[PDB]
Amino acid sequence: NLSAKVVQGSLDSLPQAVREFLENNAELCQPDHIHICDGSEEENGRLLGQMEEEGILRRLKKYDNCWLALTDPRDVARIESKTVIVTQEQRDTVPIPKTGLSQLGRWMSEEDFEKAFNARFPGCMKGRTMYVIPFSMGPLGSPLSKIGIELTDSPYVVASMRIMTRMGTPVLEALGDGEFVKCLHSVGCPLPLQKPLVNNWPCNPELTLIAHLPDRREIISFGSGYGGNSLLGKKCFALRMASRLAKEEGWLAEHMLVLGITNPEGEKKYLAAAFPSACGKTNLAMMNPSLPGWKVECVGDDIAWMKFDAQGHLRAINPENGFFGVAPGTSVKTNPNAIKTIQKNTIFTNVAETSDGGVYWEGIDEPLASGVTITSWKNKEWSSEDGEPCAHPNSRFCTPASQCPIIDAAWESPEGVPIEGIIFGGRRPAGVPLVYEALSWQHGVFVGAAMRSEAKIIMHDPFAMRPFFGYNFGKYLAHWLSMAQHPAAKLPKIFHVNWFRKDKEGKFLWPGFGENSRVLEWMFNRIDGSTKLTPIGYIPKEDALNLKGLGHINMMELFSISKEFWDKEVEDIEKYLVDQVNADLPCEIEREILALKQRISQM
Numbered sequence: 111n112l113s114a115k116v117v118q119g120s121l122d123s124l125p126q127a128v129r130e131f132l133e134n135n136a137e138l139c140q141p142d143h144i145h146i147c148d149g150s151e152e153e154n155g156r157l158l159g160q161m162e163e164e165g166i167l168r169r170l171k172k173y174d175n176c177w178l179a180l181t182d183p184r185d186v187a188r189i190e191s192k193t194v195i196v197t198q199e200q201r202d203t204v205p206i207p208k209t210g211l212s213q214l215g216r217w218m219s220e221e222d223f224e225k226a227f228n229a230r231f232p233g234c235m236k237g238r239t240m241y242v243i244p245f246s247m248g249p250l251g252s253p254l255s256k257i258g259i260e261l262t263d264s265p266y267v268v269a270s271m272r273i274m275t276r277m278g279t280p281v282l283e284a285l286g287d288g289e290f291v292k293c294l295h296s297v298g299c300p301l302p303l304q305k306p307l308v309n310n311w312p313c314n315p316e317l318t319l320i321a322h323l324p325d326r327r328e329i330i331s332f333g334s335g336y337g338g339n340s341l342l343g344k345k346c347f348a349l350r351m352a353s354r355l356a357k358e359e360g361w362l363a364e365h366m367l368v369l370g371i372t373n374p375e376g377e378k379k380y381l382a383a384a385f386p387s388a389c390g391k392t393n394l395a396m397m398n399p400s401l402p403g404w405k406v407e408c409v410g411d412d413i414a415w416m417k418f419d420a421q422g423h424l425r426a427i428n429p430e431n432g433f434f435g436v437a438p439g440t441s442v443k444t445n446p447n448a449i450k451t452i453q454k455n456t457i458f459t460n461v462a463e464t465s466d467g468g469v470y471w472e473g474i475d476e477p478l479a480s481g482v483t484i485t486s487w488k489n490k491e492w493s494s495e496d497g498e499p500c501a502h503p504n505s506r507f508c509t510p511a512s513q514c515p516i517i518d519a520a521w522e523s524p525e526g527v528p529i530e531g532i533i534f535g536g537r538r539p540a541g542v543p544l545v546y547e548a549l550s551w552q553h554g555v556f557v558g559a560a561m562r563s564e565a566k567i568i569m570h571d572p573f574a575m576r577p578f579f580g581y582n583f584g585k586y587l588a589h590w591l592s593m594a595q596h597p598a599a600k601l602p603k604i605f606h607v608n609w610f611r612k613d614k615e616g617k618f619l620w621p622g623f624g625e626n627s628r629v630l631e632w633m634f635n636r637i638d639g640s641t642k643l644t645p646i647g648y649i650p651k652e653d654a655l656n657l658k659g660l661g662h663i664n665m666m667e668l669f670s671i672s673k674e675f676w677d678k679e680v681e682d683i684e685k686y687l688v689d690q691v692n693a694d695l696p697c698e699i700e701r702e703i704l705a706l707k708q709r710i711s712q713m
């Protein structure tokens with residue numbers, strides 16, 4: 111009956127609860143076929159071939175198996191407004207702010223979401239094939255791993271999920287009759303198409319909704335084929351749904367890279383860092399350090415799940431399988447390890463294409479040969495003389511983590527790596543020194559709670575989780591505070607950096623990139639136990655930062671801490687936390703606020 115529609119695999123081979131999930135949704139969405147993904151190369155090949163035939167992807171012949179999706183410009187990034195968490199009580203999802211609307215997530219009632227779903231999913235996969243993707247977030251097996259089943263009507267999602275997660279038969283095998291996160295997704299355009307199709311890229315911007323139901327462990331997404339709205343483990347699961355499980359279960363789900371750094375004597379420390387969009391997680395995660403003899407290896411570039419082990423260390427596993435990298439700005443100079451990574455088996459989306467079948471983007475800094483021309487991401491012959499970038503500014507590559515030439519030997523180790531340092535930071539043109547260290551855990555929590563970044567607007571982005579909180583931020587701050595009470599906790603040292611301080615002509619005071627290894631060396635050694643006390647935390651003392659090999663650095667401007675500026679900053683931090691977190695702000699945080707205004711008044 112349903113079996114008749116199965117074009118790959120066997121209903122009878124699915125665990126019962128996997129099958130129910132599929133049956134129910136097949137009946138509701140009415141796809142013409144059901145394809146149970148097995149995650150094999152042959153299937154990947156077959157899917158790509160179909161995609162090429164349909165116009166969904168084109169081959170980049172300059173490389174080994176790389177492909178290019180161009181989307182409808184209307185479907186090109188994740189939309190906050192349209193992204194919601196649904197719970198019976200609003201408070202469980204975001205705090206009720208004092209004034210304004212909350213900037214810490216968006217809640218929808220169970221009733222409202224029921225109506226939104228019934229207005230979108232019934233019949234929505236007509237004429238399409240429903241793919242069933244079994245996947246594991248984290249190494250297959252690991253005690254820190256979770257599993258999801260994503261149902262989808264996009265072959266692009268499938269092929270992208272093969273890279274960003276462990277996917278296929280082996281996950282169904284590991285799941286057995288276990289629990290899983292239900293994940294339902296539909297590009298929202300049943301055939302016959304009722305509207306124009308751009309670039310063969312179906313989406314339904316007007317009905318676009320991305321929903322999370324933590325209590326039912328469901329993620330439900332409609333209307334967009336893009337990135338985080340459609341690869342349901344990449345943000346919906348990995349951050350939103352996980353941060354809630356984590357809160358329930360005693361661990362952490364964070365917007366963090368994790369790297370392993372080695373000094374010239376062979377001692378290795380793992381660090382985690384949270385920066386928001388456009389702020390360089392990916393560059394730091396697989397940096398090539400300029401300091402002679404230091405080594406940096408990549409564990410993950412975007413997400414970290416962390417859990418105290420039996421001896422009190424905070425262990426991180428990367429629950430992703432790949433890098434879903436912003437492309438523009440990537441170059442041999444800014445991120446040579448990223449460049450080597452995507453040399454193969456990589457899917458790109460919304461970047462430009464050269465006439466010899468290569469990719470191109472703003473900041474690639476790679477001169478085209480004679481007679482090579484560029485086709486922009488909108489499919490038009492392009493030049494610099496138009497006023498538009500040849501790639502979308504948040505275009506992506508999606509590449510295997512196993513191909514990073516410096517992927518860490520422990521990136522898949524099921525026990526995770528011991529985090530000895532947590533780093534926070536954003537873009538701040540003025541006022542915030544290159545690096546400082548937190549005075550205590552509690553202060554470190556406030557430091558993350560206080561993050562702002564210029565996105566000419568400077569916005570608050572606490573912990574770089576602003577679009578990703580899976581529950582009430584005030585409870586998230588208490589949960590993080592609570593770790594200082596974990597029996598025998600080895601608390602990671604906490605730091606805040608700023609690679610983007612500017613002089614008055616707007617030029618960067620710090621060269622960054624590979625030179626950030628100098629900042630790392632200072633944190634590595636503070637971890638090993640020197641400092642100068644300032645009202646905001648410790649900074650390096652005079653001559654402590656290793657500057658050999660660089661050109662001039664205006665160190666004094668770079669570490670300059672002004673009363674006027676900081677009078678302003680804490681006032682702004684205060685007003686933001688009290689209004690936005692309101693009744694949920696933990697008192698430890700109110701104390702850290704008052705204390706920093708006390709320390710600053712003394713200056």
Ligand SMILES: Nc1nc2c(ncn2[C@@H]2O[C@H](COP(=O)(O)OP(=O)(O)CP(=O)(O)O)[C@@H](O)[C@H]2O)c(=O)[nH]1
Pocket residue numbers: 385386387388389390391392393394411412434435436439444609610618621622623626
């Ligand atoms: N000036 C300067 N820019 C930096 C440095 N590190 C990264 N960048 C810039 O940050 C931007 C690239 O950041 P991006 O890759 O978006 O960061 P991400 O944190 O990985 C973003 P996402 O989570 O969405 O994938 C580019 O403008 C690149 O120049 C640095 O040390 N200095």
Ligand SMILES: [Mn+2]
Pocket residue numbers: 391392411412434435436
């Ligand atoms: Mn990134």
Ligand SMILES: [Mn+2]
Pocket residue numbers: 365412
């Ligand atoms: Mn990210």
